[PDB]
Amino acid sequence: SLPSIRQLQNLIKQAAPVEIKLVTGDAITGRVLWQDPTCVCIADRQTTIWKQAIAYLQPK
Amino acid sequence: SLPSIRQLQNLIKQAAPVEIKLVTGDAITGRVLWQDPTCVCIADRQTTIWKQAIAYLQPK
Amino acid sequence: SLPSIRQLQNLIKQAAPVEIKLVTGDAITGRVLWQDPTCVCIADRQTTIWKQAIAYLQPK
Amino acid sequence: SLPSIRQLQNLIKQAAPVEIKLVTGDAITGRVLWQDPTCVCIADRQTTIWKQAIAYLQPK
Amino acid sequence: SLPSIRQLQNLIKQAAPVEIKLVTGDAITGRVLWQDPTCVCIADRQTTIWKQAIAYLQPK
Amino acid sequence: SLPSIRQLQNLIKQAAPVEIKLVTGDAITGRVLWQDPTCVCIADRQTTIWKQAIAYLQPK
């Protein structure tokens, strides 16, 4: 899974802001800190997300 | 998984348009740019979809 | 997983019509084209489904 | 998975009636005809359930 | 997975009452009979649950 | 999974407070007592969460 790990990598690398739409309706406005197999960390209060409640992600 | 990967592969090769219905209820209109084990990328603003929120896909 | 692969097999083999109830409320009225590990293809516009948004399926 | 498979096995062996509550909210009243790694089959019209939409099962 | 199997074990061992909140809104009031890889059995009519519709569990 | 396990590990080591947002919409306010491959345990009444209903976690 390169093209997906790599986006996050290049977006933790440049601090770049992001909306993560959780399957809840949770539009999470943050800057990505880190990721790992099961989760992502978002920086607003911090809010670690489970990559599994993830519908879709976009660069703002 | 050839029958599905060949559909995404022949649709990123055509830039053919597509709706992807998410499990939130999201209809994601756009053209497919890449796929991987976990994501699809549509282009209309770019939006990478976790393939795991996907209900269904239709060519338009 | 014989008794499930086999139903689809015998229903792609006879073109036989089918309602697939997605966990969304999406009653998909089609005729099944193919399947494979992760998805099903339904023929109405085509609509590939992720076997994972699948609640239940019935022969009409 | 013996405790669960023995319950479905002793219920298809009795044709005992059953409700299966789906994660859509569906109550599926019927008698169990087969099971497999992914499906259960109820008989009331037949409806094969993806075992993955199952909330819970009760003998009636 | 010790600390979770062990709770159920020690709660099937003492018959102890339990509310299991399914991801449906299904607060299941029971006493736990057994468990196994994929499901739990609850004793009210019995109601086998799929450990997968499970949000959270509490001793009453 | 070090980035996530080290966050739960450094939060059970501090008894630091926490909200865990479930995929039901539940906000679970409390302090973390243990974790395992499938569960987290919060303490406010105790409530073990199946980690699989987790949308996201925030330190407060």
Q: Are strands B39-43 and B46-50 parallel, antiparallel or unpaired?
A: antiparallel
Closest approach of B45 to chain A, Cα-based (Å) = 8
- Experimental method, per PDB record: X-ray
Angstrom resolution of this structure: 2.3
B13 touches C: beta carbon within 8 Å = no
| Residue given tokens 């911090």 in the structure block | A46
Q: Is the Cβ–Cβ distance between A29 and A36 less than 8 Å? A: no
Residue extents of the structural domains in chain C: 1-60
Q: Is the Cβ–Cβ distance between D17 and D30 less than 8 Å? A: yes
Q: Partners for A (CB, 8 Å, 3+ pairs)? A: B, F
Q: Which of A35, A38, A46 sits opposite F58 (nearest CB)?
A: A46
Closest approach of B28 to chain A, Cα-based (Å) = 10
d(CA E48, CA E42): 6
d(CA B6, CA C1): 24
Angle, vertex CA E7, rays to CA E2 and CA E11, nearest 5:
145
Q: Pick from E33, A60, A28: which is nearest to A49 by CA?
A: A28
Residues on chain B touching C39 (C-beta within 8 angstroms): 1, 3-4
What letters, b where the CB count within 10 A reaches 16 and e where it falls short, cover B16-36? ebbbbbbbeebebebbbebbb
| Residue given tokens 């479930």 in the structure block | F22
CB atoms F56 and A22 under 8 Å: yes
Q: Is the Cβ–Cβ distance between C4 and D41 less than 8 Å? A: no
Q: Partners for B (CB, 8 Å, 3+ pairs)? A: A, C
Q: Is the Cβ–Cβ distance between B11 and B59 less than 8 Å? A: yes
Domain E1-60: give its CATH code.
2.30.30.100
Q: Pick from F22, E24, A22: which is nearest to B49 by CA?
A: A22
F34 touches E: beta carbon within 8 Å = yes
